[PDB]
Paper text:
Cas9 is a CRISPR-associated endonuclease capable of RNA-guided, site-specific DNA cleavage. Cas9 enzymes rely on a dual guide RNA structure consisting of a CRISPR RNA (crRNA) guide and a trans-activating CRISPR RNA (tracrRNA) coactivator to cleave complementary DNA targets. Formation of a complete R-loop leads to the activation of the Cas9 HNH and RuvC nuclease domains to catalyse cleavage of the TS and non-target DNA strand (NTS), respectively. Here we report a series of cryo-electron microscopy structures of Streptococcus pyogenes Cas9 capturing the directional process of target DNA hybridization.
X-ray crystallographic analysis of the 10-nt match complex at a resolution of 2.8 Å confirmed that the TS and NTS remain hybridized at the PAM-distal end of the DNA substrate. Further guide RNA–TS hybridization to form a 10-bp heteroduplex causes a rearrangement of the REC2 and REC3 domains and repositioning of the PAM-distal DNA duplex into the positively charged central binding channel formed by the REC3, RuvC and HNH domains. Here, the PAM-distal dsDNA duplex forms a continuous base stack with the sgRNA–TS heteroduplex. The displaced NTS is positioned underneath the HNH domain and continues to run parallel to the extending guide RNA–TS DNA heteroduplex. The PAM-distal duplex is wedged between the REC3 and RuvC domains and the L1 HNH linker. The relocation of the PAM-distal duplex causes the REC2 domain to shift closer to the binding channel and occlude the cleavage site in TS DNA. This shift also establishes new electrostatic interactions between a negatively charged helix in REC2 (Glu260, Asp261, Asp269, Asp272, Asp273, Asp274 and Asp276) and a positively charged helix in REC3 (Lys599, Arg629, Lys646, Lys649, Lys652, Arg653, Arg654 and Arg655), hereafter referred to as the DDD and RRR helices, respectively, which are highly conserved across Cas9 orthologues that contain a REC2 domain. The HNH nuclease domain remains docked on the RuvC and PI domains in the 6-, 8- and 10-nt match complexes, with the active site buried at the interdomain interface.
Residue numbers in the entry: 2 to 179, 181 to 716, 718 to 764, 840 to 854, 867 to 878, 893 to 903, 909 to 1368
The structure:
Amino acid sequence: DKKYSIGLAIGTNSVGWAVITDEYKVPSKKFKVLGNTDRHSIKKNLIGALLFDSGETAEATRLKRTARRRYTRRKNRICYLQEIFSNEMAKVDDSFFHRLEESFLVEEDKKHERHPIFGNIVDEVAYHEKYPTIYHLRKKLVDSTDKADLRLIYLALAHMIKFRGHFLIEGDLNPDNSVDKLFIQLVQTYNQLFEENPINASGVDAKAILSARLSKSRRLENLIAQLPGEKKNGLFGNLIALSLGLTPNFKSNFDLAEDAKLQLSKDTYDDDLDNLLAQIGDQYADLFLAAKNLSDAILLSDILRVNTEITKAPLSASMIKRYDEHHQDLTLLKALVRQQLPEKYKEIFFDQSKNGYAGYIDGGASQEEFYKFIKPILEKMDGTEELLVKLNREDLLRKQRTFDNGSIPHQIHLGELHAILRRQEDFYPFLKDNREKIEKILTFRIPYYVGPLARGNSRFAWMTRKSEETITPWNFEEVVDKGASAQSFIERMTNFDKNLPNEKVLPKHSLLYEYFTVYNELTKVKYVTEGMRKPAFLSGEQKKAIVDLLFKTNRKVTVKQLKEDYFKKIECFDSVEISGVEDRFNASLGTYHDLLKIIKDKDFLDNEENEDILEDIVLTLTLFEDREMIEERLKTYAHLFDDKVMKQLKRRRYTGWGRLSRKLINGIRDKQSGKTILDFLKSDGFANRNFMQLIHDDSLTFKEDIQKAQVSGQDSLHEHIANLAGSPAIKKGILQTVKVVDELVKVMGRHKPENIVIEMAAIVPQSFLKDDSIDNSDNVPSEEVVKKTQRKFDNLTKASELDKAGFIKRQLVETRQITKHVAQILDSRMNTKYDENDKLIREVKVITLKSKLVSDFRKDFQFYKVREINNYHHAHDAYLNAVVGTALIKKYPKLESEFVYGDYKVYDVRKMIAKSEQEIGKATAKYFFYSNIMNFFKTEITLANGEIRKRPLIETNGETGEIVWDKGRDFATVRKVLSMPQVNIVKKTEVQTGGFSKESILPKRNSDKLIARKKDWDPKKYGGFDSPTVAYSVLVVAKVEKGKSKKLKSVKELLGITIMERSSFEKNPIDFLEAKGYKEVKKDLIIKLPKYSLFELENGRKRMLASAGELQKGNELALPSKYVNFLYLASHYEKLKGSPEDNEQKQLFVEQHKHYLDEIIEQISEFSKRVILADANLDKVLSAYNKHRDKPIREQAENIIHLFTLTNLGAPAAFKYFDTTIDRKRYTSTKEVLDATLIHQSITGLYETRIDLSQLGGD
RNA sequence: AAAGAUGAGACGCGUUUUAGAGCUAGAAAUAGCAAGUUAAAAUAAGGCUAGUCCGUUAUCAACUUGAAAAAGUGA
DNA sequence: CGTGATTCCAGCGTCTCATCGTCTACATAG
DNA sequence: CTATGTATTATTGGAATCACG
Ligand SMILES: [K+]
Ligand SMILES: [K+]
Ligand SMILES: [K+]
Ligand SMILES: [K+]
Ligand SMILES: [K+]
Ligand SMILES: [K+]
Ligand SMILES: [K+]
Ligand SMILES: [K+]
Ligand SMILES: [K+]
Ligand SMILES: [K+]
């Protein structure tokens, strides 16, 4: 337990781990076995792999949460409507709302009459005859002037309020702006603005061209083609694009330097148009407004298919048109089918199982499915021409409520609602008094920047209230503080400072932040003239003069300006040499110049007084995006500026946030000096310390205060991992990796390893770079051959040394940053002590390897992997990672800085790359000359052609002399390790969480498996759910009554506690089980069993718990290494990137060892007979193997790779041997595992607790 | 620039039970014909903290001391 | 009654907002 | 190493049914 290394392979569903020693060998130990078994210890190799289900994202959970909120709020608005109608409805029908609430119940459970609207059969039939759909009643109430029944009024208004349409269009809308007329007026406006360049709209059918249901760009192409001499990218073309909904840029048409993209749907369009008009002039506003009108026209013409002058209800009229055409076409279709195809009539109009009209109306068939089913039937008959035209138009036998009604904006429903209220407020005073209340109920939306209207019990809410009361759609503006809420909406998701976790970060365009950047860059600027002797820092006076004379007069400050406008003008230097800045100063004072342009008061900007004002203004311009809220917030400073300045300030807006808070820049001060960070940046004697120096100076209290303020935690590992940027699945993997490393360190007596290697899921000679991609005579094809992608062409025509070092690095370094974070976590956990110079003592080196390294190693030295055989390949990948990484760092220690985490010296490879010498390059201190850091592993290397260079058997480090790779002794070690059959494969047991059951609301069925959707909704009458998800099973040992005599009988069985049942069972298990039917339960014998709990039965047969009523295969099939390599080589039969002679040798090995095939089959059968127990499936598999014995070896090997599904760990799965389909043999009973041996495994599986369940019993 | 991650506000369907008096013929399970497009209510059971809030992400071998939280146990 | 074999099946589309980090290249520092 | 700046797709448990003992 002294000197060892750990190799790790982190994945989305698995973490492979391995422990290696000095000689790249995997140790083995005797681990104690706890429990009541006859085995008290077991032998374990220190190598394995942890398997686990994928980590899920929160997307589905959030979508269901928002759906819940939307259903709640829709119910609430309907309740508001009923509350408004309460008293007058009670005067009309005291039980109308009651019946509308008990509509779902059956008549047995109904407390009032079964007819909802009128409470008697005659009036109900009369209403359904007079108004066949709700839209007929909507149109009638819109158009008629007669007094109407208050109940029908409520029904129409409630249908509109319950389903109100989208809110994607801002402002009011009317069918007055419905395509030819608005196109004509747009053309008139364009020709008015552009007299000299008029456009001809004659013969250009705008309605048909712009309303053809096709893509937008295609409609634009069609319309532009109708205008000769005009282009899609022209001004009129851009207007047609803006009207169609595309995003055109008017930067080319009006000759601009900024890119002003305009889209009508975006919320910024109001401000975007004002921006463009500030660049082009207000005389074009009319034009863009006409364009918007045209867009409205297109949308409304696509939605409304009726004349908008005959009725004020165009949408209801279009729905009634749908209904009438449906009626007529169904009559015609029934007649035609009765006449021509009479045998299909029953199938079409009575078989809900078929996708005919019967399955289209009463079955689950969709409109698309019905069209696909009935198109050939229409084609076979006569008189179906118009029906087929309507079918190909997706307009045949349509329903009123369909998937595309998502186009309807809330303005249309609101117009119809307002029309009804206008018509009926003449007869009902309460309607006239509450008209705006009802319209507000329909229109009101909680702004996205407000969030949930909570009162201190929602972790999602940030809204703040002006008064603490109930919030209604009518008092929202008075109770909710929209300003503070939209401030929090942004500040919840803004980063805090890395040094101060309690202080919000500054805006990026903050004057304080820009001063910080400028001064931090300016302190480190040095200058030398011919007179002076040494580089000199800029004093505080010099920095102040440079800031006042250059940064406050220019937007960008160049080094030429620093030399001429200051060192020459002020210091009177004719020649100055400036370092610390190359061509120009990266930092600049942009917001300073912007505000100087806007307010035109330099003394206001330079007075360190108005700062807090200016800062706040910039904050207001960044924090908020709504113009009205920006105005409301800047109203406090209105008295400081002119109203013109106030408007120009409103129009200015910024985006972006910095990395440092206001406190660190200017808040905290050094104790003895009393100066902030910016004060030291303005003047720090002759040291001119910068941010990093200041916060990391032990002679200042900045460092100590930063360490104190780091009281956000004292922080949890789960929190550090959770806060990382990445997918939740890889984060689950990282947490499992850290826990595995902790357990492995504890296994070695808390001894820390030497290294930890982590890996996360020939034109140019292969001696230089093993690039086998699309992009890929000596180094390159010779010049004579050249005479006879861009990177590909450059490498081909390159006919190096620096590119060789670049290859060395590209073959080596891991650019992915999540791996850097994993390395930092492991390193900070391992290395915690500091030396005499207070620098970290890296006892453990954390190495990061690319998967390409171990992949190439496997392919070069024939340690092939076959992922379909078993799960060992993860552990093998971890072991190979350990081996390759440790050997690689021992061979070339100078490359530490490239792949080992930590601040180390970056001495590079240009020195290590030898000269053109090869024979002396291996003797000199230059590390090596050939450009593959993986060449020292081979005994011979081939720079293409036939010139084979040779390497020694033993490879060592040149300087230290430590042996790094004995080619005679280490490859055999790797082979023996990869051949070990005992590998610790542990499937992470997990309690099942999530949705209670299957979301499908099933019909009524006489089955106890049905789950009531409400307490009182007996599923035998109302249907319900089935298929619950078992959170975990429970081993119960108790007695149940039996027979009519209720005699107690001892039992031992598995009860599946569902996710819905979990909290009730955990609150009191005894009462839960007794309610389930068990009596006298041994509470101490209750065993909780999560999914994938492991049992061992007879002859080593293992099973994992899939649920309380199903099991999964629990054994691994350890196939010998020779069969694995044979399967790899035989299944490929493709060029293995190796020399054609090596390919021929591998093909000859494949053909010489064909008998292996049979042996593999045998190896499967012996396994299945022992463990799988799928007699019919195994017999079918054997017959299929004997059937295709004449097939080529490659295809037989591929289908054997397929065969391994029968023996894999986990859930059974169907597979195929050629064309033979083997269905899954499932273990539909968990009765056996009640008497087997339960195995509780630690995360590595090295620690076990075995419980003989046969001991448990009530006799 | 997009992806992804996270949060917020909305829209449209889907599904369930009920209401849409089916008629005629026979001793009759039933048969023939007619009809079908719409609505109401629910949309995780529910919780208390009673909000126009929350309820499907993350985390979880065994054992021991343990209000609980945390550690400790085994070549 | 039970066990094995064999089917069958599983809520999903659309839009509007916002923030974050990925990702290399220099330069200053720890 | 770190901090700051400029530059689109299957899977697998529940449920039922049917043969067969
Ligand atoms: K979520
Ligand atoms: K959804
Ligand atoms: K609810
Ligand atoms: K889980
Ligand atoms: K849990
Ligand atoms: K929509
Ligand atoms: K909805
Ligand atoms: K008859
Ligand atoms: K659901
Ligand atoms: K486990």
